[PDB]
Amino acid sequence: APLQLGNCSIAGWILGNPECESLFSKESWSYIAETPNSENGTCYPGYFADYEELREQLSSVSSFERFEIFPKESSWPNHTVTKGVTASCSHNGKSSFYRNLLWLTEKNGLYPNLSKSYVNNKEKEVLVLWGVHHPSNIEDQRAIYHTENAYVSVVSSHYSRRFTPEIAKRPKVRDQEGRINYYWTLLEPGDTIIFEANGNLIAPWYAFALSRG
Amino acid sequence: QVQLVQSGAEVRKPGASVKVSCKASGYTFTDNYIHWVRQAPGQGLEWMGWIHPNSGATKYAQKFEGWVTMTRDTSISTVYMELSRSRSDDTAVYYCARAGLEPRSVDYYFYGLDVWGQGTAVTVSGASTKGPSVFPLAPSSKSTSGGTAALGCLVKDYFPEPVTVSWNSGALTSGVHTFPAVLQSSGLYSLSSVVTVPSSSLGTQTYICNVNHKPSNTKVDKRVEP
Amino acid sequence: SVLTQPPSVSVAPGQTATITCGGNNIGRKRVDWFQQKPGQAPVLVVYERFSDSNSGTTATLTISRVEAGDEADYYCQVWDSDSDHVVFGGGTKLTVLGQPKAAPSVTLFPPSSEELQANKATLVCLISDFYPGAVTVAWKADSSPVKAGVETTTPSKQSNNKYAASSYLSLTPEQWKSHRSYSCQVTHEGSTVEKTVAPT
Ligand SMILES: *[C@@H]1O[C@H](CO)[C@@H](O[C@@H]2O[C@H](CO)[C@@H](O)[C@H](O)[C@H]2NC(C)=O)[C@H](O)[C@H]1NC(C)=O
Ligand SMILES: *[C@@H]1O[C@H](CO)[C@@H](O)[C@H](O)[C@H]1NC(C)=O
Numbered sequence: 041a042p043l044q045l046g047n048c049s050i051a052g053w054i055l056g057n058p059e060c061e062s063l064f065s066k067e068s069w070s071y072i073a074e075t076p077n078s079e080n081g082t083c084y085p086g087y088f089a090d091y092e093e094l095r096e097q098l099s100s101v102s103s104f105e106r107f108e109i110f111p112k113e114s115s116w117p118n119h120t121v122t123k124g125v126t127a128s129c130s131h132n133g134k135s136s137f138y139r140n141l142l143w144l145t146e147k148n149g150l151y152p153n154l155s156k157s158y159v160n161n162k163e164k165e166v167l168v169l170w171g172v173h174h175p176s177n178i179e180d181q182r183a184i185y186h187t188e189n190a191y192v193s194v195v196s197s198h199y200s201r202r203f204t205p206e207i208a209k210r211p212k213v214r215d216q217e218g219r220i221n222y223y224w225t226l227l228e229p230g231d232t233i234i235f236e237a238n239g240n241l242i243a244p245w246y247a248f249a250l251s252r253g
Numbered sequence: 254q255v256q257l258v259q260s261g262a263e264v265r266k267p268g269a270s271v272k273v274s275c276k277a278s279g280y281t282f283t284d285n286y287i288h289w290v291r292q293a294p295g296q297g298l299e300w301m302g303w304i305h306p307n308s309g310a311t312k313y314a315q316k317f318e319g320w321v322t323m324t325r326d327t328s329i330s331t332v333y334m335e336l337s338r339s340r341s342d343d344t345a346v347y348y349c350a351r352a353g354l355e356p357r358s359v360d361y362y363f364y365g366l367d368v369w370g371q372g373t374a375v376t377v378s379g380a381s382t383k384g385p386s387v388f389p390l391a392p393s394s395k396s397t398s399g400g401t402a403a404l405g406c407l408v409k410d411y412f413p414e415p416v417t418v419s420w421n422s423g424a425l426t427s428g429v430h431t432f433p434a435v436l437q438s439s440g441l442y443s444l445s446s447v448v449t450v451p452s453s454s455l456g457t458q459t460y461i462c463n464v465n466h467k468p469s470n471t472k473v474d475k476r477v478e479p
Numbered sequence: 480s481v482l483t484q485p486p487s488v489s490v491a492p493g494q495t496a497t498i499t500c501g502g503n504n505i506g507r508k509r510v511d512w513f514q515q516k517p518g519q520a521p522v523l524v525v526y527e528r529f530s531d532s533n534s535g536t537t538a539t540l541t542i543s544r545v546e547a548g549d550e551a552d553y554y555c556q557v558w559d560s561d562s563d564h565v566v567f568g569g570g571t572k573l574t575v576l577g578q579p580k581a582a583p584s585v586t587l588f589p590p591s592s593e594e595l596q597a598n599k600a601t602l603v604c605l606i607s608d609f610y611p612g613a614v615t616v617a618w619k620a621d622s623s624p625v626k627a628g629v630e631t632t633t634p635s636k637q638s639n640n641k642y643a644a645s646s647y648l649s650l651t652p653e654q655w656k657s658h659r660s661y662s663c664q665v666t667h668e669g670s671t672v673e674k675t676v677a678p679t
Binding site: 288290294295297298299300303312314315348354360361363365366367368369370371372386388389390391393395396403405407409430432433434435436437438443444445447 | 507508509511513520521522523554556558563564565566567568569570586588589590591592593594597599601603605607628630631632633635637638643645647649674676
């Protein structure tokens with residue numbers, strides 16, 4: 041059984057593109073039925089790390105469970121969750137964002153150090169997706185995240201990498217100079233994944249529990 | 254609900270630090286920005302800067318960086334702007350506004366100025382009390398219009414306000430219009446009074462304008478003649 | 480930076496009013512409009528009668544069924560990321576007529592003889608009986624602009640609800656005697672009035 045992505049790419053579908061999500065809901069598939077042309081892909085420009093590896097692993101999975109890895113209402117009390125919308129990902133004429141990610145911004149003129157984690161109790165291998173924002177100008181970065189030396193730290197027994205975003209003026213793509221770079225990992229059952237950052241983090245709103253067999 | 258109260262209007266001599274207070278109620282002081290803007294009398298406003306009570310971070314405009322200093326006290330929920338080193342051009346009404354218009358998108362992440370304050374009038378001129386200098390505005394041939402002329406007197410270089418003008422000891426009130434005064438770059442005031450009278454009374458009826466300046470006790474009577 | 484607004488707009492009551500705010504890269508940026516009645520603290524324009532529509536390099540504020548209470552001073556505002564500064568517009572004096580328009584009458588008095596004998600020279604230019612209350616005053620000395628020693632008051636209500644303004648220009652007795660003529664040039668709704676005094 042294929043997956044029939046249509047105009048959507050895997051990167052667009054894996055992340056929750058707004059014009060994508062209207063057509064996908066499967067649990068046990070084996071193929072792709074996808075067109076590489078991303079009419080509905082990364083609505084925000086950037087690089088999907090280990091994309092090629094990620095298509096192989098998603099292909100042919102027995103189970104597909106989408107669950108709230110970090111509830112938007114409860115997980116981030118000291119940060120703003122309602123202002124992370126853009127026209128690059130606009131839907132039905134209104135600015136929107138990925139259905140599976142979350143753009144934390146400053147709350148009450150402060151971006152406190154954040155520390156949150158998931159201990160994989162689902163007994164199945166879990167797919168966790170996060171992004172790191174790279175703004176175009178220093179003033180936008182200061183307005184949204186306050187700190188000018190931002191850091192993002194993701195640590196697990198299987199994955200460990202610390203991101204340091206930088207302010208770069210990149211050619212305009214989808215009317216946006218800034219970029220988010222997208223990263224992923226697979227969480228073993230019984231393993232914990234930790235996010236520590238002071239800004240520029242696109243937090244995972246939803247994660248996928250799967251079994252390839 | 255929410256409101257911003259400001260310290261009353263202070264008058265100071267040039268070169269003195271003048272501080273304006275802005276107090277917030279009905280909302281948690283730590284929430285939103287407070288911006289300061291100034292409006293020169295009869296001109297537009299100029300943004301000056303902002304400070305966030307939660308972080309204490311401040312940001313100033315280029316023209317205002319250096320001399321203005323903005324502080325806050327969370328305990329009394331009051332924000333301050335200090336105007337170190339006063340000079341005449343700083344005479345203006347100064348407003349404080351909170352940034353409560355929450356931005357909708359990350360693209361334009363800027364809180365707009367939703368609620369403002371009453372306004373504090375900062376007056377700096379110095380200048381000692383000085384008596385008016387009266388110069389009759391003599392009617393010329395071009396001022397004559399046939400059946401009605403145009404004449405008056407000029408009150409120039411005086412301080413402070415006010416000055417009252419009357420014509421022929423108050424008997425001539427028809428056609429009289431006294432203008433408000435202007436602040437010259439010298440720091441002194443000047444206004445003009447004009448009387449509209451038939452061009453037939455020239456060289457026949459005598460026109461005298463009475464100038465009274467109470468703060469310096471200077472009364473000036475002055476004939477206006479063709 | 481440098482948002483530009485019109486000095487004055489006049490609209491008849493019950494009609495529509497548009498205010499233009501021009502600047503670079505307004506684009507994605509929203510424009511906040513503030514309304515300042517005379518002697519009042521400006522308030523934010525929140526929004527049926529009030530509506531904005533921004534397109535490219537110009538933002539516009541439109542008022543439908545203009546009322547007497549709507550009349551005030553309007554100010555557009557945009558944050559400039561590069562300059563890191565909040566930029567305010569120059570200003571719009573919107574005038575809902577409610578009163579027959581009128582072109583100002585100008586009266587220019589020469590320096591008086593006893594001011595000349597006191598070693599001072601001041602030209603009095605009197606602008607009266609006009610509506611709306613917004614003019615631009617330009618001085619001239621033998622058809623050449625003079626932009627020093629000039630002082631102009633902002634217009635205010637007369638005895639007859641019309642507005643009045645004045646403007647001075649201070650000389651020494653030598654500058655007054657050194658030129659053939661001095662001119663006071665007023666502009667109002669495109670029309671321009673010039674008055675001239677000469678040392679004879
Ligand atoms: C956010 O994390 C930074 C980095 O750890 C904190 O800064 C350090 O705070 C400790 C306090 O014990 C100091 O000893 C260090 O010198 C600070 N700097 C560094 C580079 O470590 C900061 O305090 C944290 N902020 C909050 C609100 O928790
Ligand atoms: C911020 O985080 C602290 C925990 O460190 C929590 O107690 C508090 O409710 C949060 N929100 C605010 C507004 O302080």
